[PDB]
Amino acid sequence: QAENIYNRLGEDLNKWQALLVQIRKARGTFDNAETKKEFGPVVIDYGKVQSKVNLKYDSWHKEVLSKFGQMLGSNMTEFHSQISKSRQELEQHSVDT
Amino acid sequence: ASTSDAVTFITYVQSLKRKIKQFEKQVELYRNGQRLLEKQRFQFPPSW
């Protein structure tokens, strides 16, 4: 559940960095080279399903990248807004009243 | 025992009779929703 995942992850910067690191590691874990990994007399035809599923795992990684991109856009907008409010306060009515 | 209490009980009975159709509609909605949430795999929220 994407909403549950986002709610669990939250808006902590350490949480965002951890999500990025874990997603990158998982995406790297899907190096699809051998398709028909047939273990036994009956050839387990996991090839095309696994290739498309790896494409889907990378698609979920890109979706998580987009969701974290929106979350980091909100976080960077908030941080820049707070810093710019402080800078505007210093420029208009500085601390030396 | 009182006339006002008997009238209140009668009003409650009439409200229950009027809301019986609403309760049947809610029961049908609940059955359809249980079926849909099961079929689509729309897992219920943990606190839900």
């Binding site: 951890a18 690191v21 874990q22 590691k25 | -």
Partner: peptide, 24 residues
């Protein structure tokens, strides 16, 4: 790493909740 640890923790929690929902 804590990154993949949290990712896999959310994955395992989702898996457990879904499997409970996936009695079928």
């Amino acid at each position: 790493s804590e990154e993949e640890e949290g990712q896999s923790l959310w994955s395992s929690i989702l898996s457990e909740v879904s499997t409970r929902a996936r009695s079928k």
